[PDB]
Design a protein around this ligand. Structure first.
Ligand code: CL
Ligand code: CL
Ligand code: CL
Ligand code: CL
Ligand code: K
Ligand code: MG
Ligand code: MG
Ligand code: MG
Ligand code: MG
Ligand code: MG
Ligand code: MG
Ligand code: MG
Ligand code: MG
Ligand code: MG
Ligand code: MG
Ligand code: MG
Ligand code: MG
Ligand code: MG
Ligand code: MG
Ligand code: MG
Ligand code: MG
Ligand code: MG
Ligand code: MG
Ligand code: NA
Ligand code: NA
Ligand code: NA
Ligand code: NA
Ligand code: NA
Ligand code: NA
Ligand code: NA
Ligand code: NA
Ligand code: NA
Ligand code: NA
Ligand code: NA
Lengths: 194, 237, 56, 92
RNA sequence: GCUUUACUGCAGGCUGUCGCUGAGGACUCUCACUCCGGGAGGAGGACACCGAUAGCCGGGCA
RNA sequence: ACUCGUACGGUCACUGAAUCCUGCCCAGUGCAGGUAUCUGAACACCUCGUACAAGAGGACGAAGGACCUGUCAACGGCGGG
RNA sequence: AAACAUCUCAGUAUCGGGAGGAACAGAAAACGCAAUGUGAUGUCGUUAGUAACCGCGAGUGAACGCGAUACAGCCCAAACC
């Protein structure tokens, strides 16, 4: 039969409908008064978290991060530029907001490593994402056959090197075929053309 | 070219800043729980470096000692009162509502409790004209008719120091000393006496503005100089 | 007043001094920042790629 | 100059002389879906748009004759070289 | 380097539209949001701000 | 930043103590106000087109412009016959 | 590009953040010599200056496949407990 979880998911398909619509209208009010990065005891979208790797276990942390909406906050040029580069308003960053959120959260918890993250809505100018982080030094995690992999030294600062969920998608590594010529194995190895 | 003077201003550097550290007090109406009981005694009359006008030191019943935006006619010893039930005499502060129409007022709040915003310069005054349960119409020194919440507190009387503007500075030196007490760059060099690189009016074999002096409201900083969005110029008509 | 020799006379102000972190006489005692190693400004050591030829 | 609205002449389709009808070629309307149209959209961005930032050439003092010769029996038309003419009016 | 009704663009200002955004060609309200108030509460209010976009101005700048 | 400031303020410009004065011009350009009508983008809307889409067209029309007005101690002008 | 605006120099120089002894990638919502076919991923050789881009100017520029190197395939979420 349907898992209870399936209901949380179903609700979040249309976040501006039904009960969840009212919850959001409620919550954001408190969120907007909260800080850039706030650790929360429980994931707002349990199905999502668990689906991403979350477990109610020691060493598993979740945190909501607020990021401003819109294009790049860019300074206009202060020297000679050909028209093509005199741009300011339409320039957008190559990193998506969810990735920024993941990095901000990770910096708040220097000892933790990002596991994954998901969106929890947005108002007119914020965008909120909840980041799941893990304590690579806490046994319980070191002893978990499903998360211990993140304890490896090779995983130090995953987010900052784009080894994250959104990291890899933002890097155009989704497709294994046509279109990923300048993407895989890495952008830099491909002269930065994707 | 280079940023014009008006643009250097905004950066807020020493040269454009007011000698705040040399200022005395931020003149604002006291906060009263309610009842009005609050009254105090004028202890002294001092000079306000920020407004070139006198200000009164007052000791309030509950021990509080604060400088006040003094209206004309307040002397050491006098007892001032602030509240809904304050008597109606010069120097006392109370909501526009409790004030009798036809009375000159100063240091008027824009919104109840903001501590006073309008009519605070030397010898100026507002004029409470109309009352109501919803709107208190005051005429500000600029001549404009302002609609204010009757809950907006004010002080009875005109600001002290009237007539300051009557005496000419006579000499650059006097301007100087005054200017040194304000957030302002002085003296003033005319744009037309500058180089093209420094001001839209700069340049030329002789001194004259390049284009007309009336500039659009939409002009960008660096270009908005001269007569800003002038509805007219000159004296004729 | 000449901007040359005559203006060299007022130079008795101490600014750059032996740095506690790198040992270079580059610690600006007025700014409390080393122009050589970044001490006082950066935890990481001051270094740029332009301190050498691009391909080296 | 003047020119008859109809007259006998060779029809490259019928392959034999027949009465043709002369008309001035009316400009066809653009669909805005040709390759050039897509390149304009695609290639225009921040700053100068190369070729797409240019504007309408100009005019020669007199234009050449732009006509359609329509066969009166098979209904198929054909084109001919034009010749400079300040004005062209048809007779009847 | 400088100028401008040189060419081409770029900031900025004004203006329409969409999102935030809600209730009953002009209108009321309150619940988001904004401001005032120490608080109670007051003013304003689906506008403004902010994000996106469109038109006009635009040697301020390249 | 101005601003511990509030029109007797402070910002932006022109002229440059005093004395006697400061004429005429609003067509152009600038600024500002108004505007029946005209012009005026995008979204949404309507028509055609496409089993969808591209696309063509319509309706509505903001600022702006046309048009009208004010303004020269605003740019400036004050001739020939 | 014999000027120059798109283009080019070039995602270069330089700047910000970070890992390791190597990084990264990786077991198909692939390929599409269209097949009764191939079978994770890097890399080398080639495919090829080919396809594709471009004031269709100057210039720019892959991939599938093939021959090699080395080979390796698995764990959750959920259902049911
Ligand atoms: Cl990390
Ligand atoms: Cl003054
Ligand atoms: Cl013709
Ligand atoms: Cl194959
Ligand atoms: K160039
Ligand atoms: Mg590699
Ligand atoms: Mg103050
Ligand atoms: Mg004066
Ligand atoms: Mg004197
Ligand atoms: Mg000063
Ligand atoms: Mg001067
Ligand atoms: Mg000079
Ligand atoms: Mg200039
Ligand atoms: Mg002069
Ligand atoms: Mg002059
Ligand atoms: Mg020198
Ligand atoms: Mg362009
Ligand atoms: Mg506030
Ligand atoms: Mg220039
Ligand atoms: Mg060249
Ligand atoms: Mg050429
Ligand atoms: Mg290239
Ligand atoms: Mg292929
Ligand atoms: Na971390
Ligand atoms: Na790309
Ligand atoms: Na000049
Ligand atoms: Na493209
Ligand atoms: Na020069
Ligand atoms: Na005129
Ligand atoms: Na005029
Ligand atoms: Na050349
Ligand atoms: Na040249
Ligand atoms: Na090109
Ligand atoms: Na083969």
């Amino acid at each position: 039969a349907r898992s209870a979880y399936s209901y949380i998911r179903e609700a979040w398909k249309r976040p501006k409908e039904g009960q969840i619509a009212e919850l959001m209208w409620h919550r954001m009010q408190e969120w907007r008064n909260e800080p850039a990065v706030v650790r929360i005891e429980r994931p707002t979208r349990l199905d999502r978290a668990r689906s991403l790797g979350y477990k109610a276990k020691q060493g598993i942390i979740v945190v909501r991060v607020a990021i401003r909406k819109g294009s790049s906050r860019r300074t206009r040029f202060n020297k000679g530029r050909r028209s093509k580069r005199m741009m300011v308003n339409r320039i957008t960053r190559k990193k998506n907001i969810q990735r920024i959120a993941e990095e901000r959260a990770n910096r708040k918890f220097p000892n933790l490593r990002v596991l994954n993250s998901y969106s929890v809505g947005e108002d007119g100018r914020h965008k909120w994402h909840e980041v799941i982080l893990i304590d690579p030094d806490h046994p319980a995690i070191k002893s978990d056959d499903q998360l211990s992999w993140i304890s490896r030294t090779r995983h130090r600062l995953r987010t900052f090197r784009g080894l994250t969920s959104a990291g890899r998608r933002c890097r155009g590594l989704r497709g294994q075929g046509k279109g990923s010529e300048k993407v895989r194995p890495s952008l830099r190895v491909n002269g930065a053309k994707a | 070219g280079r940023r014009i003077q008006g643009q250097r201003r905004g950066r807020g550097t020493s040269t454009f800043r007011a000698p705040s550290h040399r200022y005395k007090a931020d003149l604002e109406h006291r906060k009263v729980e309610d009842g009005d009981v609050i009254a105090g005694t004028v202890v002294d009359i001092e000079h306000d470096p920020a407004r070139s006008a006198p200000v009164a030191a007052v000791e309030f019943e509950d021990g509080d000692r604060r400088l006040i935006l003094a209206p004309e006619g307040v002397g050491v010893g006098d007892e001032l009162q602030v509240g809904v039930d304050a008597e109606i005499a010069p120097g006392n502060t109370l909501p526009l509502a409790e004030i009798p129409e036809g009375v000159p007022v100063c240091n008027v709040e824009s919104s109840p409790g903001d501590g006073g915003k309008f009519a605070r310069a030397s010898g100026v005054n507002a004029q409470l004209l109309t009352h109501d349960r919803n709107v208190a119409v005051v005429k500000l020194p600029s001549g404009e008719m302002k609609r204010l919440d009757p809950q907006c507190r004010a002080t009875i009387g005109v600001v002290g120091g009237g007539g300051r503007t009557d005496k000419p500075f006579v000499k650059a030196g006097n301007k100087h000393h005054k200017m040194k007490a304000r957030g302002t760059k002085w003296p003033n060099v005319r744009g037309v006496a500058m180089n093209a690189v420094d001001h839209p009016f700069g340049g030329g074999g002789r001194q004259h503005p390049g284009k007309p002096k009336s500039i659009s409201r939409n002009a960008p900083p660096g270009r908005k100089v001269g007569d800003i969005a002038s509805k007219r110029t000159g004296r004729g008509g | 007043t000449g901007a040359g020799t005559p203006s060299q006379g007022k130079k008795n102000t101490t600014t750059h001094t032996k740095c506690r972190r790198c040992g270079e006489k580059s610690y600006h005692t007025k700014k409390k920042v080393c122009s050589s190693c970044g001490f006082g400004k950066s935890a990481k050591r001051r270094d740029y790629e332009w301190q050498s030829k691009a391909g080296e | 100059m003047q020119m008859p609205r109809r007259f006998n002449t060779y029809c490259p389709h019928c392959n034999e002389h027949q009465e043709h009808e002369v008309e001035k070629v009316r400009s066809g309307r653009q669909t805005g879906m040709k390759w050039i149209d897509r390149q304009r959209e695609r290639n225009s961005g921040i700053g100068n748009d190369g070729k797409f930032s240019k504007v309408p050439g100009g005019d020669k003092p007199t234009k050449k004759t732009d006509l359609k010769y329509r066969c009166g029996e098979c209904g198929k038309a054909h084109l001919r070289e034009g010749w400079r003419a300040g004005r062209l009016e048809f007779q009847e």
